[PDB]
Scaffold this active site. Sequence first.
Site, PDB file in Angstrom:
ATOM      1  N   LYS B  59       0.741  -1.363  -0.051  1.00 52.48           N
ATOM      2  CA  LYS B  59      -0.071  -0.020  -0.202  1.00 52.48           C
ATOM      3  C   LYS B  59       0.812   1.234   0.251  1.00 52.48           C
ATOM      4  O   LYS B  59       0.624   2.158   0.854  1.00 52.48           O
ATOM      5  CB  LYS B  59      -0.859  -0.010   1.219  1.00 52.48           C
ATOM      6  CG  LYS B  59      -2.207  -1.012   1.059  1.00 52.48           C
ATOM      7  CD  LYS B  59      -2.837  -0.960  -0.031  1.00 52.48           C
ATOM      8  CE  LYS B  59      -4.229  -1.785   0.246  1.00 52.48           C
ATOM      9  NZ  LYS B  59      -3.810  -3.202   0.135  1.00 52.48           N
ATOM     10  N   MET B 164     -13.813  -9.719  -1.745  1.00 50.63           N
ATOM     11  CA  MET B 164     -14.637 -11.106  -2.025  1.00 50.63           C
ATOM     12  C   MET B 164     -14.651 -12.170  -1.133  1.00 50.63           C
ATOM     13  O   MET B 164     -13.415 -12.620  -0.705  1.00 50.63           O
ATOM     14  CB  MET B 164     -14.038 -11.631  -3.541  1.00 50.63           C
ATOM     15  CG  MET B 164     -13.824 -10.494  -4.727  1.00 50.63           C
ATOM     16  SD  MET B 164     -15.341  -9.611  -5.265  1.00 50.63           S
ATOM     17  CE  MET B 164     -15.762  -8.450  -3.904  1.00 50.63           C
ATOM     18  N   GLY B 165     -15.709 -12.648  -0.832  1.00 52.99           N
ATOM     19  CA  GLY B 165     -15.655 -13.704   0.318  1.00 52.99           C
ATOM     20  C   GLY B 165     -15.995 -12.954   1.645  1.00 52.99           C
ATOM     21  O   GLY B 165     -17.075 -12.553   2.037  1.00 52.99           O
ATOM     22  N   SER B 166     -14.772 -12.888   2.433  1.00 51.03           N
ATOM     23  CA  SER B 166     -14.931 -12.444   3.609  1.00 51.03           C
ATOM     24  C   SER B 166     -15.736 -11.084   3.944  1.00 51.03           C
ATOM     25  O   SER B 166     -16.501 -10.708   4.796  1.00 51.03           O
ATOM     26  CB  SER B 166     -13.516 -12.278   4.336  1.00 51.03           C
ATOM     27  OG  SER B 166     -12.892 -13.403   4.213  1.00 51.03           O
ATOM     28  N   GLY B 172     -17.159 -13.591  -8.650  1.00 50.56           N
ATOM     29  CA  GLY B 172     -17.423 -13.454  -9.956  1.00 50.56           C
ATOM     30  C   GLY B 172     -18.144 -12.053 -10.260  1.00 50.56           C
ATOM     31  O   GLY B 172     -18.049 -11.444 -11.148  1.00 50.56           O
ATOM     32  N   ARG B 186      -8.464 -14.463   2.961  1.00 46.89           N
ATOM     33  CA  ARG B 186      -8.911 -15.304   3.943  1.00 46.89           C
ATOM     34  C   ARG B 186      -9.729 -16.579   3.483  1.00 46.89           C
ATOM     35  O   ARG B 186      -9.762 -17.349   4.009  1.00 46.89           O
ATOM     36  CB  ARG B 186      -9.690 -14.527   5.057  1.00 46.89           C
ATOM     37  CG  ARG B 186      -8.800 -13.892   6.072  1.00 46.89           C
ATOM     38  CD  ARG B 186      -9.722 -12.650   6.714  1.00 46.89           C
ATOM     39  NE  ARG B 186     -10.093 -11.533   5.852  1.00 46.89           N
ATOM     40  CZ  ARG B 186     -10.819 -10.605   6.227  1.00 46.89           C
ATOM     41  NH1 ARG B 186     -10.977 -10.400   7.590  1.00 46.89           N
ATOM     42  NH2 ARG B 186     -11.023  -9.447   5.377  1.00 46.89           N
TER      43      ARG B 186
HETATM   44  O1  LIG Z   1      -9.776  -1.799  -0.664  1.00 45.83           O
HETATM   45  C1  LIG Z   1      -8.837  -2.637  -0.492  1.00 45.83           C
HETATM   46  C2  LIG Z   1      -7.824  -2.749  -1.125  1.00 45.83           C
HETATM   47  C3  LIG Z   1      -6.825  -3.828  -1.070  1.00 45.83           C
HETATM   48  O2  LIG Z   1      -5.804  -3.960  -1.527  1.00 45.83           O
HETATM   49  N1  LIG Z   1      -7.443  -4.881  -0.268  1.00 45.83           N
HETATM   50  C4  LIG Z   1      -6.812  -6.141  -0.036  1.00 45.83           C
HETATM   51  O3  LIG Z   1      -7.220  -7.249  -0.737  1.00 45.83           O
HETATM   52  C5  LIG Z   1      -7.177  -8.358   0.212  1.00 45.83           C
HETATM   53  C6  LIG Z   1      -8.545  -8.657   0.940  1.00 45.83           C
HETATM   54  O4  LIG Z   1      -8.256  -9.992   1.553  1.00 45.83           O
HETATM   55  P1  LIG Z   1      -9.643 -10.827   2.202  1.00 45.83           P
HETATM   56  O5  LIG Z   1     -10.107 -11.647   0.889  1.00 45.83           O
HETATM   57  O6  LIG Z   1      -8.997 -11.959   3.132  1.00 45.83           O
HETATM   58  O7  LIG Z   1     -10.510  -9.749   2.635  1.00 45.83           O
HETATM   59  C7  LIG Z   1      -6.185  -8.044   1.119  1.00 45.83           C
HETATM   60  O8  LIG Z   1      -4.866  -8.343   0.846  1.00 45.83           O
HETATM   61  C8  LIG Z   1      -6.122  -6.352   1.304  1.00 45.83           C
HETATM   62  O9  LIG Z   1      -5.010  -5.626   1.730  1.00 45.83           O
HETATM   63  C9  LIG Z   1      -8.640  -4.843   0.160  1.00 45.83           C
HETATM   64  O10 LIG Z   1      -9.044  -5.759   1.002  1.00 45.83           O
HETATM   65  N2  LIG Z   1      -9.578  -3.511   0.184  1.00 45.83           N
END
Ligand SMILES: O=c1cc(O)n([C@@H]2O[C@H](COP(=O)(O)O)[C@@H](O)[C@H]2O)c(=O)[nH]1
EC number: 4.1.1.23
Lengths: 213, 213
Positions: B59, B164-166, B172, B186
């Site tokens: 970031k 996406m997901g968590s 999709g 995650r």
């Molecule tokens: O706005 C954003 C920008 C991101 O890079 N991310 C990144 O996307 C990933 C999301 O991971 P997760 O699927 O476990 O939520 C993390 O690496 C996070 O730093 C995000 O979640 N939101």
Amino acid sequence: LKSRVILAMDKPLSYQVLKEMENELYGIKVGLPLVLDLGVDKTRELLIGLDVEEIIVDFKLADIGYIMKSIVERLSFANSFIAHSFIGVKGSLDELKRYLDANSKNLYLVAVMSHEGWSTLFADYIKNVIREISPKGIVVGGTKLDHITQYRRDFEKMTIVSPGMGSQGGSYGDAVCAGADYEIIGRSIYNAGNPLTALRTINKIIEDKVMKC
Amino acid sequence: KSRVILAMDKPLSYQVLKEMENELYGIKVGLPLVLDLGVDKTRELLIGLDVEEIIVDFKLADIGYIMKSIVERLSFANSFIAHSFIGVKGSLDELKRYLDANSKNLYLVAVMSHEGWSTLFADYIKNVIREISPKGIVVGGTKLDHITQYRRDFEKMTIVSPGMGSQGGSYGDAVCAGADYEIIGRSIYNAGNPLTALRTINKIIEDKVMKCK
Ligand SMILES: O=c1cc(O)n([C@@H]2O[C@H](COP(=O)(O)O)[C@@H](O)[C@H]2O)c(=O)[nH]1
Ligand SMILES: O=c1cc(O)n([C@@H]2O[C@H](COP(=O)(O)O)[C@@H](O)[C@H]2O)c(=O)[nH]1
């Protein structure tokens, strides 16, 4: 008097030099390039051998809350952390602030950066984020003295730290004169032929400036 | 063929990654991973892998000098993610120049996935992106309308979408809204069987894409 300098340790200095600096600095800001070079374990070991008022880990945290928390949990040796304010509160800073408060760590929020390309378009939003989060302190560029004075007015009890001194053009002490508590200084110290002499000289200049202030 | 970029924000075994390599588009290296393994072991783990793109995501959000110092330490990667908010002169301009000189791709964070991300800077961000002209942008998969809008605005840009997901995004939906790839952490690395999770997700994405296409 006591030092108003926070060493921006973005590059390693010997323990010998850092040991002499201990009592002539307010704090050390540990930067990402340093931690990437040494690793977390050796960074912790390095700092363990030092005694300063504040150790601030600065990875410019700017992610979702889960990721910022995951980062800071790995860096318990710090007293305080720096994050950006622009990312906002819900699902980002609120989660981080909750975690840091629970673990007795301080937060500093980046308010105004030192480079020319930083926009001050959103000061109202940025100030609201800050007011809402209620961090220990904020970062306001020492190259932006009018912003320093403005933020000190709008946030009387806030710790204000100001980088951009020396290398970036800020004249030592101007930020403290304009309202900052501490000036963050990197290259002008750590790339000096003698970083210790550099620090001692800067502390003198800052002392002088503040008096004429 | 996979549209998934694995957000490696915690370690996974070489064993698992080797089976994943042929069922992913790419891998996004997160800061907690690198803090855990160190840079040298991160290198070892990932260069030993066969995916289309490795993106290092710290970031990036600092002055140019510091951002360049960071990426020079992780140059095995193909691409790097930086924030667009920090602006151009003295920050992103120096980074882009350095990345170009080294045949690296830059992705800018355009719209973040969490609730607290303000739409206030939408126009400013778009301008920064046009000025910098990065390979890609990060647009939250929880912000499907923003994906579509940004796709129209920057038809030639790579769009990657986390959340996406968590975070509640349905696998999709981001691609269907016009993103090229979906970033997933995650939901995969914390799964009982990450390989099964990825295969399940790939199936879900393929089904959806075939309908929205
Ligand atoms: O706005 C954003 C920008 C991101 O890079 N991310 C990144 O996307 C990933 C999301 O991971 P997760 O699927 O476990 O939520 C993390 O690496 C996070 O730093 C995000 O979640 N939101
Ligand atoms: O707006 C800002 C905010 C910062 O934290 N910094 C930090 O302050 C330090 C300045 O270093 P230098 O004195 O060598 O210019 C660096 O660690 C940098 O990341 C900055 O330069 N500008």
